[PDB]
CSV table of N, CA and C in Angstrom, one decimal:
chain,number,residue,atom,x,y,z
A,1418,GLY,N,9.5,9.2,-5.3
A,1418,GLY,CA,10.6,8.5,-4.7
A,1418,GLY,C,10.2,7.6,-3.5
A,1419,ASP,N,9.2,8.1,-2.8
A,1419,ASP,CA,8.7,7.4,-1.6
A,1419,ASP,C,7.2,7.2,-1.6
A,1420,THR,N,6.6,7.6,-2.7
A,1420,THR,CA,5.1,7.6,-2.9
A,1420,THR,C,4.7,7.0,-4.2
A,1421,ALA,N,3.8,6.0,-4.2
A,1421,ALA,CA,3.3,5.5,-5.5
A,1421,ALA,C,1.9,6.1,-5.8
A,1422,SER,N,1.7,6.4,-7.1
A,1422,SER,CA,0.5,7.0,-7.5
A,1422,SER,C,-0.3,6.0,-8.5
A,1423,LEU,N,-1.4,5.6,-8.0
A,1423,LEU,CA,-2.3,4.6,-8.8
A,1423,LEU,C,-3.5,5.3,-9.4
A,1424,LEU,N,-3.6,5.3,-10.7
A,1424,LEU,CA,-4.8,5.8,-11.4
A,1424,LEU,C,-5.9,4.8,-11.5
A,1425,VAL,N,-7.1,5.1,-11.0
A,1425,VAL,CA,-8.2,4.2,-10.9
A,1425,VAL,C,-9.3,4.6,-11.9
A,1426,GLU,N,-9.5,3.7,-12.9
A,1426,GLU,CA,-10.5,3.9,-13.9
A,1426,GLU,C,-11.9,3.5,-13.6
A,1427,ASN,N,-12.9,4.1,-14.3
A,1427,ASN,CA,-14.3,3.8,-14.0
A,1427,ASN,C,-14.8,4.2,-12.7
A,1428,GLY,N,-14.1,5.2,-12.1
A,1428,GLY,CA,-14.4,5.8,-10.8
A,1428,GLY,C,-14.6,4.7,-9.7
A,1429,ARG,N,-13.7,3.8,-9.8
A,1429,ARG,CA,-13.7,2.6,-8.9
A,1429,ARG,C,-13.1,2.9,-7.6
A,1430,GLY,N,-12.5,4.1,-7.5
A,1430,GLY,CA,-11.7,4.4,-6.3
A,1430,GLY,C,-12.7,4.5,-5.1
A,1431,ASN,N,-13.9,4.8,-5.3
A,1431,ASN,CA,-14.9,4.8,-4.2
A,1431,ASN,C,-15.3,3.4,-3.7
A,1432,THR,N,-15.0,2.4,-4.6
A,1432,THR,CA,-15.3,1.0,-4.2
A,1432,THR,C,-14.0,0.3,-3.9
A,1433,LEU,N,-12.9,0.9,-4.3
A,1433,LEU,CA,-11.6,0.3,-4.2
A,1433,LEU,C,-11.1,0.2,-2.7
A,1434,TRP,N,-11.3,1.3,-2.0
A,1434,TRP,CA,-10.8,1.5,-0.7
A,1434,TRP,C,-11.2,0.4,0.2
A,1435,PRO,N,-12.4,0.1,0.3
A,1435,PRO,CA,-13.0,-1.0,1.1
A,1435,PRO,C,-12.5,-2.4,0.7
A,1436,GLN,N,-12.2,-2.5,-0.6
A,1436,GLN,CA,-11.6,-3.7,-1.1
A,1436,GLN,C,-10.1,-3.8,-0.7
A,1437,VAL,N,-9.4,-2.7,-0.7
A,1437,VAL,CA,-8.0,-2.6,-0.2
A,1437,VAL,C,-8.0,-3.1,1.3
A,1438,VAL,N,-8.9,-2.7,2.1
A,1438,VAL,CA,-9.0,-3.1,3.5
A,1438,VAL,C,-9.2,-4.6,3.5
A,1439,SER,N,-10.2,-5.1,2.7
A,1439,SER,CA,-10.5,-6.6,2.7
A,1439,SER,C,-9.3,-7.4,2.2
A,1440,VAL,N,-8.5,-6.9,1.3
A,1440,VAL,CA,-7.4,-7.6,0.7
A,1440,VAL,C,-6.2,-7.6,1.7
A,1441,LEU,N,-6.0,-6.5,2.4
A,1441,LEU,CA,-5.0,-6.3,3.4
A,1441,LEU,C,-5.3,-7.3,4.6
A,1442,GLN,N,-6.5,-7.5,5.0
A,1442,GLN,CA,-6.9,-8.4,6.0
A,1442,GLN,C,-6.7,-9.9,5.5
A,1443,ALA,N,-7.0,-10.0,4.2
A,1443,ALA,CA,-6.8,-11.3,3.5
A,1443,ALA,C,-5.4,-11.8,3.5
A,1444,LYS,N,-4.5,-10.8,3.5
A,1444,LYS,CA,-3.0,-11.0,3.4
A,1444,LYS,C,-2.5,-11.1,4.8
A,1445,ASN,N,-3.3,-11.0,5.8
A,1445,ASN,CA,-2.9,-11.0,7.2
A,1445,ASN,C,-2.1,-9.8,7.6
A,1446,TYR,N,-2.4,-8.6,7.0
A,1446,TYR,CA,-1.7,-7.4,7.3
A,1446,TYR,C,-2.6,-6.5,8.2
A,1447,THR,N,-2.0,-6.2,9.3
A,1447,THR,CA,-2.7,-5.4,10.3
A,1447,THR,C,-2.9,-4.0,9.9
A,1448,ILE,N,-4.1,-3.4,10.1
A,1448,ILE,CA,-4.4,-2.0,9.8
A,1448,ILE,C,-4.6,-1.3,11.2
A,1449,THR,N,-3.9,-0.2,11.3
A,1449,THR,CA,-3.8,0.5,12.6
A,1449,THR,C,-4.9,1.6,12.7
A,1450,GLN,N,-5.3,2.1,11.6
A,1450,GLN,CA,-6.4,3.1,11.6
A,1450,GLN,C,-7.1,3.1,10.2
A,1451,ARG,N,-8.4,3.4,10.1
A,1451,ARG,CA,-9.1,3.5,8.9
A,1451,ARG,C,-10.2,4.5,9.0
A,1452,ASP,N,-10.5,5.1,7.8
A,1452,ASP,CA,-11.5,6.2,7.7
A,1452,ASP,C,-12.3,6.0,6.4
A,1453,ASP,N,-13.5,5.4,6.5
A,1453,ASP,CA,-14.3,5.2,5.3
A,1453,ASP,C,-14.7,6.5,4.7
A,1454,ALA,N,-15.2,7.5,5.5
A,1454,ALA,CA,-15.6,8.7,5.0
A,1454,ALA,C,-14.5,9.5,4.2
A,1455,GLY,N,-13.3,9.5,4.8
A,1455,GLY,CA,-12.2,10.1,4.1
A,1455,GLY,C,-11.4,9.2,3.2
A,1456,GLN,N,-11.9,8.0,3.1
A,1456,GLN,CA,-11.3,6.9,2.3
A,1456,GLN,C,-9.7,6.9,2.5
A,1457,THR,N,-9.4,6.8,3.8
A,1457,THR,CA,-7.9,6.8,4.2
A,1457,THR,C,-7.7,5.8,5.3
A,1458,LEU,N,-6.5,5.2,5.2
A,1458,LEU,CA,-6.1,4.2,6.2
A,1458,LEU,C,-4.6,4.2,6.4
A,1459,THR,N,-4.2,3.7,7.5
A,1459,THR,CA,-2.7,3.4,7.7
A,1459,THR,C,-2.5,2.0,8.2
A,1460,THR,N,-1.5,1.4,7.6
A,1460,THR,CA,-1.2,0.0,8.0
A,1460,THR,C,-0.1,-0.1,9.0
A,1461,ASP,N,0.0,-1.3,9.6
A,1461,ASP,CA,1.1,-1.6,10.5
A,1461,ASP,C,2.3,-2.2,9.7
A,1462,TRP,N,3.4,-2.6,10.4
A,1462,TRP,CA,4.5,-3.2,9.7
A,1462,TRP,C,4.1,-4.3,8.7
A,1463,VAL,N,4.3,-4.1,7.5
A,1463,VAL,CA,4.0,-5.0,6.4
A,1463,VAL,C,5.2,-5.8,6.0
A,1464,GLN,N,5.2,-7.1,6.1
A,1464,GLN,CA,6.3,-8.0,5.6
A,1464,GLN,C,5.9,-8.6,4.3
A,1465,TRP,N,6.8,-8.3,3.3
A,1465,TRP,CA,6.6,-8.9,1.9
A,1465,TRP,C,7.4,-10.2,1.8
A,1466,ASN,N,7.1,-10.9,0.7
A,1466,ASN,CA,7.8,-12.2,0.4
A,1466,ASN,C,8.2,-12.3,-1.0
A,1467,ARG,N,9.2,-11.6,-1.4
A,1467,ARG,CA,9.7,-11.7,-2.8
A,1467,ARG,C,10.6,-12.9,-2.9
A,1468,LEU,N,10.8,-13.4,-4.2
A,1468,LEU,CA,11.6,-14.6,-4.4
A,1468,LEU,C,13.1,-14.4,-4.1
A,1469,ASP,N,13.5,-13.1,-4.2
A,1469,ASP,CA,14.9,-12.8,-3.9
A,1469,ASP,C,15.0,-12.1,-2.5
A,1470,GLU,N,13.9,-12.2,-1.7
A,1470,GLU,CA,13.9,-11.6,-0.4
A,1470,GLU,C,14.2,-12.6,0.7
A,1471,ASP,N,15.3,-12.5,1.4
A,1471,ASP,CA,15.7,-13.4,2.5
A,1471,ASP,C,15.5,-12.7,3.8
A,1472,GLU,N,15.8,-11.4,3.9
A,1472,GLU,CA,15.8,-10.7,5.1
A,1472,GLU,C,14.3,-10.2,5.4
A,1473,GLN,N,14.0,-10.2,6.7
A,1473,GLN,CA,12.7,-9.7,7.2
A,1473,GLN,C,12.5,-8.2,7.0
A,1474,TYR,N,11.5,-7.8,6.2
A,1474,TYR,CA,11.2,-6.4,5.9
A,1474,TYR,C,10.1,-6.0,6.8
A,1475,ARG,N,10.2,-4.7,7.3
A,1475,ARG,CA,9.1,-4.1,8.1
A,1475,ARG,C,9.0,-2.6,7.7
A,1476,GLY,N,7.9,-2.0,8.0
A,1476,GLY,CA,7.6,-0.7,7.6
A,1476,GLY,C,6.1,-0.5,7.3
A,1477,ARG,N,5.6,0.7,7.4
A,1477,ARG,CA,4.2,1.0,7.3
A,1477,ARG,C,3.8,1.7,6.0
A,1478,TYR,N,2.5,1.7,5.7
A,1478,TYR,CA,2.0,2.3,4.5
A,1478,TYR,C,0.8,3.2,4.8
A,1479,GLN,N,0.8,4.4,4.2
A,1479,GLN,CA,-0.4,5.2,4.3
A,1479,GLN,C,-1.1,5.3,2.9
A,1480,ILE,N,-2.4,4.8,2.9
A,1480,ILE,CA,-3.2,4.7,1.7
A,1480,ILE,C,-4.4,5.7,1.7
A,1481,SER,N,-4.4,6.6,0.8
A,1481,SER,CA,-5.4,7.6,0.8
A,1481,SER,C,-6.0,7.8,-0.6
A,1482,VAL,N,-7.3,7.8,-0.7
A,1482,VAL,CA,-8.0,7.9,-2.0
A,1482,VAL,C,-8.4,9.3,-2.3
A,1483,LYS,N,-8.1,9.8,-3.5
A,1483,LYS,CA,-8.4,11.2,-3.8
A,1483,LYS,C,-9.1,11.3,-5.2
A,1484,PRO,N,-10.2,12.1,-5.2
A,1484,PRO,CA,-10.9,12.2,-6.5
A,1484,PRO,C,-10.2,13.0,-7.5
A,1485,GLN,N,-10.3,12.7,-8.7
A,1485,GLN,CA,-9.6,13.4,-9.8
A,1485,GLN,C,-10.5,13.7,-11.0
A,1486,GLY,N,-11.3,14.6,-10.8
A,1486,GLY,CA,-12.3,15.0,-11.9
A,1486,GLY,C,-13.4,14.0,-12.0
A,1487,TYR,N,-13.4,13.2,-13.0
A,1487,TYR,CA,-14.4,12.1,-13.2
A,1487,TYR,C,-13.8,10.8,-12.9
A,1488,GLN,N,-12.5,10.7,-12.6
A,1488,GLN,CA,-11.9,9.5,-12.2
A,1488,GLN,C,-11.3,9.6,-10.8
A,1489,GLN,N,-10.7,8.5,-10.3
A,1489,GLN,CA,-10.1,8.5,-8.9
A,1489,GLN,C,-8.7,8.1,-9.0
A,1490,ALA,N,-7.9,8.5,-7.9
A,1490,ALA,CA,-6.5,8.2,-7.8
A,1490,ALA,C,-6.3,7.7,-6.4
A,1491,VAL,N,-5.2,6.8,-6.2
A,1491,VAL,CA,-4.8,6.3,-4.9
A,1491,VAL,C,-3.4,6.7,-4.6
A,1492,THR,N,-3.2,7.4,-3.5
A,1492,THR,CA,-1.9,7.8,-3.0
A,1492,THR,C,-1.4,6.8,-2.0
A,1493,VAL,N,-0.2,6.2,-2.3
A,1493,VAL,CA,0.4,5.2,-1.4
A,1493,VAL,C,1.8,5.6,-0.9
A,1494,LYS,N,1.8,6.1,0.3
A,1494,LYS,CA,3.1,6.7,0.8
A,1494,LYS,C,3.8,5.7,1.7
A,1495,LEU,N,5.1,5.4,1.4
A,1495,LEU,CA,5.9,4.6,2.3
A,1495,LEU,C,6.3,5.3,3.6
A,1496,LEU,N,6.0,4.8,4.7
A,1496,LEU,CA,6.2,5.4,6.0
A,1496,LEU,C,7.5,5.0,6.6
A,1497,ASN,N,8.0,3.8,6.3
A,1497,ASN,CA,9.2,3.3,6.9
A,1497,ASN,C,9.7,2.2,6.0
A,1498,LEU,N,11.1,2.1,5.9
A,1498,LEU,CA,11.7,1.0,5.2
A,1498,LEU,C,12.9,0.4,6.0
A,1499,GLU,N,12.6,-0.7,6.7
A,1499,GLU,CA,13.7,-1.4,7.4
A,1499,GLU,C,13.9,-2.8,7.0
A,1500,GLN,N,15.1,-3.1,6.5
A,1500,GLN,CA,15.4,-4.5,6.2
A,1500,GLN,C,16.3,-5.1,7.3
A,1501,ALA,N,15.7,-6.0,8.0
A,1501,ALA,CA,16.3,-6.7,9.1
A,1501,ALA,C,16.6,-5.6,10.2
A,1502,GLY,N,15.8,-4.6,10.3
A,1502,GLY,CA,15.9,-3.6,11.3
A,1502,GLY,C,16.9,-2.5,10.9
A,1503,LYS,N,17.2,-2.5,9.6
A,1503,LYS,CA,18.1,-1.5,9.0
A,1503,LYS,C,17.5,-0.5,8.1
A,1504,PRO,N,17.3,0.7,8.5
A,1504,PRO,CA,16.7,1.7,7.7
A,1504,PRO,C,17.4,1.9,6.4
A,1505,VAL,N,16.6,1.9,5.3
A,1505,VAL,CA,17.2,2.1,4.0
A,1505,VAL,C,16.7,3.4,3.4
A,1506,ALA,N,17.6,4.3,3.1
A,1506,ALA,CA,17.2,5.6,2.6
A,1506,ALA,C,17.2,5.7,1.1
A,1507,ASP,N,17.6,4.5,0.5
A,1507,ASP,CA,17.6,4.4,-1.0
A,1507,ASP,C,16.3,4.7,-1.6
A,1508,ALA,N,16.2,5.7,-2.4
A,1508,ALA,CA,14.9,6.1,-3.0
A,1508,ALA,C,14.4,5.1,-3.9
A,1509,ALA,N,15.2,4.4,-4.6
A,1509,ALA,CA,14.9,3.3,-5.5
A,1509,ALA,C,14.2,2.2,-4.8
A,1510,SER,N,14.8,1.7,-3.7
A,1510,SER,CA,14.2,0.7,-2.8
A,1510,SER,C,12.8,1.2,-2.3
A,1511,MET,N,12.8,2.4,-1.9
A,1511,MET,CA,11.5,3.0,-1.3
A,1511,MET,C,10.4,3.0,-2.3
A,1512,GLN,N,10.7,3.4,-3.5
A,1512,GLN,CA,9.8,3.3,-4.6
A,1512,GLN,C,9.3,1.9,-4.9
A,1513,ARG,N,10.2,1.0,-4.9
A,1513,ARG,CA,9.9,-0.4,-5.1
A,1513,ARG,C,8.9,-1.0,-4.1
A,1514,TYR,N,9.1,-0.6,-2.9
A,1514,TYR,CA,8.2,-1.0,-1.8
A,1514,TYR,C,6.9,-0.3,-1.8
A,1515,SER,N,6.9,1.0,-2.2
A,1515,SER,CA,5.7,1.8,-2.3
A,1515,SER,C,4.8,1.3,-3.4
A,1516,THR,N,5.4,0.7,-4.4
A,1516,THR,CA,4.6,0.1,-5.5
A,1516,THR,C,4.3,-1.4,-5.3
A,1517,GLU,N,5.0,-2.0,-4.4
A,1517,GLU,CA,4.7,-3.3,-3.9
A,1517,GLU,C,3.3,-3.4,-3.2
A,1518,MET,N,3.0,-2.3,-2.5
A,1518,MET,CA,1.7,-2.2,-1.9
A,1518,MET,C,0.6,-1.8,-3.0
A,1519,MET,N,1.0,-0.9,-3.9
A,1519,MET,CA,0.2,-0.5,-5.0
A,1519,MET,C,-0.3,-1.7,-5.8
A,1520,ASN,N,0.6,-2.7,-5.9
A,1520,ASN,CA,0.3,-3.9,-6.7
A,1520,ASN,C,-0.8,-4.7,-6.0
A,1521,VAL,N,-0.7,-4.7,-4.7
A,1521,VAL,CA,-1.8,-5.4,-3.9
A,1521,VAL,C,-3.1,-4.7,-4.0
A,1522,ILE,N,-3.0,-3.3,-4.1
A,1522,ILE,CA,-4.2,-2.5,-4.3
A,1522,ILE,C,-4.8,-2.7,-5.7
A,1523,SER,N,-4.0,-2.8,-6.7
A,1523,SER,CA,-4.4,-3.0,-8.0
A,1523,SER,C,-5.0,-4.4,-8.2
A,1524,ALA,N,-4.6,-5.4,-7.4
A,1524,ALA,CA,-5.2,-6.7,-7.4
A,1524,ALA,C,-6.7,-6.6,-7.0
A,1525,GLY,N,-7.0,-5.8,-6.0
A,1525,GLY,CA,-8.3,-5.6,-5.5
A,1525,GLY,C,-9.1,-4.8,-6.5
A,1526,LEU,N,-8.4,-3.9,-7.2
A,1526,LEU,CA,-9.1,-3.1,-8.3
A,1526,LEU,C,-9.5,-3.9,-9.4
A,1527,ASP,N,-8.7,-4.9,-9.8
A,1527,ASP,CA,-9.1,-5.9,-10.8
A,1527,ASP,C,-10.4,-6.7,-10.4
A,1528,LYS,N,-10.5,-6.9,-9.1
A,1528,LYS,CA,-11.6,-7.7,-8.6
A,1528,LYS,C,-12.9,-6.8,-8.6
A,1529,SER,N,-12.7,-5.5,-8.4
A,1529,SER,CA,-13.8,-4.5,-8.4
A,1529,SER,C,-14.2,-4.2,-9.8
């Protein structure tokens, strides 16, 4: 409801994390903390630009990579959801935003 789960094939999760950092910076998204060894990072207020998005969105994301047997997975937790400074508790919206970041991660996964 507030967390997206990305399955990473070919054990690319070990190479994905640093690509996520690179892509985040490429999108001009500030990262507040990062940990290569623990493959975990936390972002600052991320503003998206959907075609039907008029209001300024803000809120943070926690991205943590976890091993899953012979494959990897990425946990993307939505830390905050504010539309024009208005907290939205709607789980559907939160899911949509949590997967909006996952989509950016999967873009870097395709590159890897």
